[PDB]
Amino acid sequence: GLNTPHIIMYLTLQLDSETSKEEQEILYHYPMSEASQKLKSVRGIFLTLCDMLENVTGTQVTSSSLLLNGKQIHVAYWKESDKLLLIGLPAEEVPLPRLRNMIENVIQTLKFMYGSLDSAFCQIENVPRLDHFFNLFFQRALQPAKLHAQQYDASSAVLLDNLPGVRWLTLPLEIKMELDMALSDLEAADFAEDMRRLYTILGSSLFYKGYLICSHLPKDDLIDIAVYCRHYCLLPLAAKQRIGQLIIWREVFPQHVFPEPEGRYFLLVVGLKHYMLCVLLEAGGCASKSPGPDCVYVDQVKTTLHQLDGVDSRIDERLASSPVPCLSCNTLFHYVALETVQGIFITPTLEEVAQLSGSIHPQLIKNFHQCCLSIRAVFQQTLVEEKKKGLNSGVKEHGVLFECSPAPPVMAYWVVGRLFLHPKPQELYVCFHDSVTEIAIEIAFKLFFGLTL
């Protein structure tokens, strides 16, 4: 409920606590309600620790546990420039491994939308926008019941939010090429009225019904757009509801052997009829040099969507025409496949799991995603250790079995995943009955072989 204590504060770590200004340490906070106020009163704890523990140890505080009102609250930290972001959420709704990834997504989103984390908070004009953002953030993390077959995504979110990737839909090549050509038709375009071009189209990506279909955009830019869309529920909106017209215009700061050119970037997102098309535009660079949408870029994405509406039924047939590989109520039950180098997950469709439904089924799905999060935490520790070595230069498999039963039938329920590193960093998750003696290499080969974005 909304009465459960949680808080966000942005604090300065120049701890001149003797000065006269009230709450000079707080540059921003949300919510304003009483449930947060006790957390606000203990703000001095975070300040003391964020100075002290990096003096004691070689690194920043990342998280902490407080108990308040009988709740265990996990509080995340980010000391960006002797200036601290802090987020506190109940452990009852938010596992620590979820929170640390959530703050990371918040940090990336703030930098993406505002250029830098510290300045985003130091700007007073960004306060009501921060309040709106955190209102949405503290509904997803704390009160999931709003949900913005039943609650399939909510059970999925336990795992789906943690992975470094985007839900994506595998297609037959006969469909894929119409979709890729439509993006190429947009990306090559330059239309006006002899004039300097307004923007370079850095790239674009297409989603349908919450699934990424294809992308001409770079992986790093796909990740940042997807995280933004999670926080604003744009993808689930397309998945559940028919959008008449959506238009979003934002200035963005997507990080961007010659050096990368100087410029400013704009994110345009337009969507109709469960499609959502994202375009990342560059000012400067090859192009002219903040403005609202220029209309012409909106017209080009809308035209692209009209072309894509000719194949939506073909995609729906792929969604409807039995699971691939097939699933049983062959004893495969579920999977998630991820190439970390590209913004791709491969998953059973909502339609395909609904087609697999039963009284046992929805419980099994929740168990799968929750176990996969517990697996991800182990892989993520490994990924960080390996990344540190990779940075200095310029663990492998996990699974569990749960016997489950509705004198009902008793079914084995393996949840397994594997991490590959050398030719690519890629992760696989699968679920199956113990009746089939599966090999992870055989499956990973079958799923990853021939795969392309």
Binding site: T170, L173, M177, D180, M181, S184, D185, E187, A188, D194, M195, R196, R197, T200, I201, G203, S215, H216, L217, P218, K219, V257, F258, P261, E282, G285, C286, V324, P325, E339, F420, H422, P423, K424, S435, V436, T437, I439, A440, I441, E442, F445, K446, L447, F448, F449, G450, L451, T452, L453
Partner: protein, 545 residues
């Protein structure tokens, strides 16, 4: 690092076939570290690939197979053929004819018919051809062409015809059959100092006949029928140049008619050959571990080195993959630009290797005599050894590919493994035209991969677009027009990609090649900010206006 993942099914019951424990990539039938064997039994039995064969009636599969195994070890096999993926026949010099049937990679039925043994008078059968209506037989020391006609489809009649060829006492007479059963050939590697070393044979109206004969200019490495205009007889003849160096002469006959010959120079004398299913690629194995491919359309001879002597080669029936096999059991995979591909047998850990060693398969002295993709998917490779085991190698060729392994699928895997240089060489081997649709999609996979991520990669983008813009051998205009719209769009994105980096001169040249209105202005505004180029771009813009 890209590889194909395979599983082997060994049909022999011999205990000499020392497959290692936990070698899950190889399965064997069993007759009627142990815990690892039991674990493999569990996998095999969770699977539909049984650890042991039925000894029960009527099939008596264990016993019928055991007799086949005895026949394989004690007699030379002159023929093996497939009618479909589950149907095979093989014939022995003993005169015993055997037919077997499969389910999946596993044996279901064995039938042994020994009744022909006492009816066919012969001396050393060297070869045979099999059809449902008839069998053609040939011998090492006779001018007898033995012809068997079945009243079934056993119950059969035996006829003999006289072979017109020379030196019947020692000459080895090879046979081949058209898919049209009305035409057959017989040939031999004649060396001498009445003249023919190839016969054209017909079949009609219940009778075998000799129609005509030729003498070839050189003694053949192979003789084969075409699939187009099927009566046409293709050959590959190894030869010696006036240079006193080896060459391959691809003579073609319509007999005395030699309609065409092509001479391909070799690093060393050819030892084997095969034709690609599109027939546009001839591949020869050669001495000193060399592999030579000639592309007729691109009219280019490609060379590659191999890690094994290529005594046996066979094209995958999709045409996308070549297998190279040593008689000693080494196997290597090549693409159609002769890049090596790594091979792995199924295992719990990922270990791609450039060759596969079948020397691990057995302690037997038996040598590999045949690799064959099974005739009408096609993920099964039949293997035969003389006086050795039979079995089939299964290729686990993707789920989303639905088991397919076209050139397009190899390209996608090379994109997944970032083997781009190799993917481009394949793209160059596509020859567009008839293959242009598959080539186009393969190009798109390469260009999108590179546009999403350095001058080395720019060179790869230039070349990939270059396979359409600057063909080694020109495209048909209707091919150009089919892809013209999409290729230009992929090039336009590349131009913009280049402009973002300070490499305007090459981008400028592409702007000239594309010639789009105002395209040059994209050089001008950047060069305007090398500043001299800005005025040049203004001039180029004026050349359209």
């Amino acid at each position: 690092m890209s590889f194909c993942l395979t599983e082997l099914h060994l049909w022999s019951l011999k205990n000499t076939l020392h497959i290692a424990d936990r070698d899950i990539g190889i399965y064997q039938y069993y007759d009627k570290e142990h815990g690892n064997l039991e674990k493999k039994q569990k996998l095999a039995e969770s699977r539909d690939y049984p650890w042991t064969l039925k000894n029960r009636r009527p099939e008596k599969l264990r016993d019928s197979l055991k007799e086949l195994e005895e026949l394989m070890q004690n007699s030379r096999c002159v023929l093996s053929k497939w009618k479909n993926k589950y149907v095979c026949q093989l014939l022995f010099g003993s005169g015993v004819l055997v037919s077997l049937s499969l389910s999946g990679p596993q044996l279901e039925k064995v039938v042994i018919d020994r009744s022909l043994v006492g009816k066919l008078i012969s001396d050393t059968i060297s070869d045979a051809l099999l059809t449902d209506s008839f069998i053609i037989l040939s011998f090492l020391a006779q001018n007898k062409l033995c012809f068997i006609q079945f009243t079934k489809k056993l119950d059969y009649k035996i006829f003999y015809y006289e072979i017109p060829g020379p030196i019947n006492k020692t000459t080895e007479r090879h046979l081949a059959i058209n898919c049209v059963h009305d035409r057959v050939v017989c040939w031999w590697p004649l060396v001498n100092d009445d003249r023919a070393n190839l016969l054209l044979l017909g079949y009609a109206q219940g009778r075998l006949e000799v129609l005509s004969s030729v003498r070839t200019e050189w003694d053949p490495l192979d003789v084969r029928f075409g699939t187009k205009q099927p009566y046409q007889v293709f050959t590959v003849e190894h030869s010696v140049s006036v240079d006193k160096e080896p060459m391959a002469d691809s003579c073609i006959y319509e007999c005395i008619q030699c309609v065409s010959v092509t001479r391909i120079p070799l690093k060393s004398k050819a030892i084997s050959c095969c034709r690609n299913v599109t027939e546009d690629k001839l591949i020869l194995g050669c001495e000193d571990s060399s592999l030579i491919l000639y592309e007729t359309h691109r009219r280019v001879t490609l060379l590659a080195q191999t890690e094994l002597l290529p005594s046996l080669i066979s094209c995958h029936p999709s045409g996308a993959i070549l297998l190279v096999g040593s008689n000693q059991g080494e196997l290597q995979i090549f693409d159609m630009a002769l890049s090596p591909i790594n091979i792995q047998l199924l295992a719990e850990d990922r270990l791609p290797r450039e060759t596969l060693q079948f020397s691990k398969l057995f302690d037997a002295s038996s040598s590999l005599v045949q690799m064959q993709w099974i005739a009408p998917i096609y993920d099964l490779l039949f293997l035969r050894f003389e006086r050795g085991p039979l079995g089939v190698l299964l290729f686990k060729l993707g789920v989303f590919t639905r088991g397919q392994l076209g050139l397009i699928d190899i390209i996608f895997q090379y994109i997944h493994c970032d083997e781009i240089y190799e993917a481009i060489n394949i793209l160059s081997s596509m020859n567009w035209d008839t293959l242009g649709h598959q080539c186009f999609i393969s190009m798109s996979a390469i260009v999108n991969h590179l546009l999403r991520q350095t001058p080395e990669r720019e060179a790869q983008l230039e070349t990939s677009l270059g396979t359409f813009y600057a063909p080694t051998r020109p495209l048909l205009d209707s091919t150009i027009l089919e892809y013209r719209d999409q290729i230009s769009k992929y090039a336009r994105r590349f131009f913009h990609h280049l402009l973002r980096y300070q490499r305007f001169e090459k981008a400028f040249l592409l702007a000239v090649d594309v010639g789009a209105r105002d395209l040059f202005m994209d050089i001008h505004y950047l060069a305007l900010d090398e500043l001299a180029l800005a005025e040049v771009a203004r001039k180029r813009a004026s050349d359209i206006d």
